[PDB]
Design a protein around this nucleic acid. Structure first.
Lengths: 62, 60, 60, 62, 60, 60
RNA sequence: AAAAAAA
RNA sequence: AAAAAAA
């Protein structure tokens, strides 16, 4: 199920950990996980931006 | 759950937006409408963007 | 749907379109027909394009 | 539904039309449609090769 | 319907194969096993290839 | 499943692995955990990798 | 739209 | 692993 993905993202969100989100094309976005659902992650770095999970390679604490 | 309100808020306030595609290309315009699979992005003309091709949507 | 009426209008009105693919290649032609997964695009040839390979459909 | 895709491919198969299959990375394969199902197309050009539909951009008569 | 028998025939006859990935990379070895989502390709070691990453499977 | 036993063996035996991504980048580490959609890979950092971005998992 | 950069 | 080639 989502027994890894949801607790991993929730912890980053709860703890306001700065993250790097690497996209599948190698572009690295930085910010905080504001929220997420089945399909998207909202990545906040003053501005809120919506990232499709389909375009993400990895999520790592910065 | 979060996708629709995020896109709608941009449409509602006519926020100029950037849509970055999975291949790195940046498209700019206004969110005119959206459904399960697509976003209509308006500039001079309305073009239909497939969600599967999008990496991010962000105010410009 | 926003997608289906958009494609149907383009198809019925025989509107010249540009289809941009995920590899950056631009196809041009008229939308001859479409279904859940594919679009039939006609120019000098008649070609079945998978929607998963499309980024955008733009009136030319 | 598959009201376009299945009759398009079946006609190519039935009529033994030489086809070009462009992959999503721009590589062009050539051969005849031997058969297909939900996920793959078998492309025959003396040898039978299995092509995942997820990797295909377009199918066109050659 | 066609995928499983195609892969199995290659495994059964120990046919040396090429698996071409969506990014153009060619992997070579023997089909050792497969399930809904992956193919195990054996050379010196067995590596697990995700089907979503594969364009084609062909005898080498 | 062939996938789950393969990943589980790698995880339990703390086998160093190379994960090749769709963009050609090679990650290295140990499989800390996995579920339907993601793998947690640990090296000097602990990183959640989406399976859709992975081409292969190779014992290093 | 490089019959295909064991990455 | 180019905070991102209106293609």
């Amino acid at each position: 199920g989502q027994s890894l993905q949801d607790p991993f993202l929730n912890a980053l969100r709860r703890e306001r950990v700065p993250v790097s989100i690497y996209l599948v094309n190698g572009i690295k976005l930085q910010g905080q996980i504001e929220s997420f659902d089945q399909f998207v992650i909202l990545l906040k770095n003053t501005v809120s931006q919506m990232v499709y999970k389909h375009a993400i390679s990895t999520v790592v604490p910065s």
